[PDB]
Paper text:
The results showed that both SARS-CoV-2 Orf6CTT and SARS-CoV-1 Orf6CTT competed with ssRNA for binding to the Rae1–Nup98GLEBS in a concentration-dependent manner. The composite omit map of two structures unequivocally showed that residues 53–61 of SARS-CoV-2 Orf6 and residues 50–62 of SARS-CoV-1 Orf6 accommodate the same site of Rae1. Each peptide of Orf6CTT adopts an identical elongated loop conformation (0.43 Å RMSD for 9 Cαs) and binds to the Rae1–Nup98GLEBS heterodimer alongside blades 5 to 6 of Rae1 β-propeller. The sidechain of a conserved methionine (M58) in both Orf6CTT inserts into the hydrophobic pocket made up of residues F257, W300, D301, K302 and R305 in Rae1, which provides high steric complementarity and buries a large surface area.
We determined the crystal structures of both SARS-CoV-2 and SARS-CoV-1 Orf6 C-termini in complex with the Rae1–Nup98 heterodimer.
Residue numbers in the entry:
A (entry chain X): 50 to 62
B (entry chain B): 158 to 174, 179 to 213
C (entry chain A): 25 to 263, 265 to 366
The structure:
Amino acid sequence: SELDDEEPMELDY
Amino acid sequence: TGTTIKFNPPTGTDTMVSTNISTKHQCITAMKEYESKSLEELRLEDYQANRK
Amino acid sequence: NHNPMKDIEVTSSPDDSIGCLSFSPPTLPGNFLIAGSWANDVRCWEVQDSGQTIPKAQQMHTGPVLDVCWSDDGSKVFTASCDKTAKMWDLSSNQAIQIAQHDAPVKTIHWIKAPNYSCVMTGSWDKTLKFWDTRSSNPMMVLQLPERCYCADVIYPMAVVATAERGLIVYQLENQPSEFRRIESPLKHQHRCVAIFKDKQNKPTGFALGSIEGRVAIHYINPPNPAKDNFTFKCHRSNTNTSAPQDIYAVNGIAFHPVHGTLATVGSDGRFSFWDKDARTKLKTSEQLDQPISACCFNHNGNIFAYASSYDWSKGHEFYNPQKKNYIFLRNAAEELKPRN
């Protein structure tokens, strides 16, 4: 039960 | 009706981090020939034609 | 390959592509999963806390089942079909009766339990939204839609409907349903799925909306800075610093975790991803499955995430294998969807 790396969303502009 | 026209993923451009990049739209309703219907609408048409 | 996440497989999966999933309400002890498929059936399984699954009951439409939902007391299952009808399914007696009729397939179905009324909502490709008391043959209410209905969601007192040609309408449900706001869509391509989310005080406050163009919109009904509080993010695209063109896949389902307010998306790329729309981050993306993920949902407390591995016609009929085997996977994703810190 390990957790992946939280990445930032690819927002628009 | 149905999906008789062969699927060909349309190409476009988008942005990434800012640089424009080329894209391939892997969804048949992205083609001009299929854009006025949904995936489910097209599937029902193929089902009613026994085109499975 | 077929189960890259090594998640729990539901025993006796549907025989054709899975179109919809829906878990039992908290009024019902235990957890019961409903699924409708393109072989025209509706199925019910009991999920046991051990993870083990018991096929319980089954019903039939005469066309593919596009949506399902539960009554608030857990005693009825409602079903919507391409045969242009909807049924009410009493589990205790395993009998189903017609409660609704449209002039075209019925894409969406929802239960509205309001303080002064209860009804079934059906959204159809005949460009109507209808409401049923499950007793009379006449709809309690008929509303015209601007186009064919493609997805909908309800959390009293809010409902949201999206149609073909970027139609998007929010309804209020107090006393009697009525159009509340016609929204200029934040997405530029075919709408596909929609899910309402709630504010920190548990009142419905916005929705998330997915398109066929690898994009999800977050829309608050009444935020202080809409330019800034509403946004769109990219998802379900191929990735690696490659220079090949990026592949864009359809977003097939969205559901919010009932406890954490985070969300999951499932796509035509055979992946699911978990997101935090307040931190604006990606909490997880799954390994890629050997076919699209066609539907998903949570159980009542969020301990169970269910997703369906099924072809979604995203490449047309030539890519349909009438069977490759279909799957429903259960994953305990509660801590994976908990916001960070």
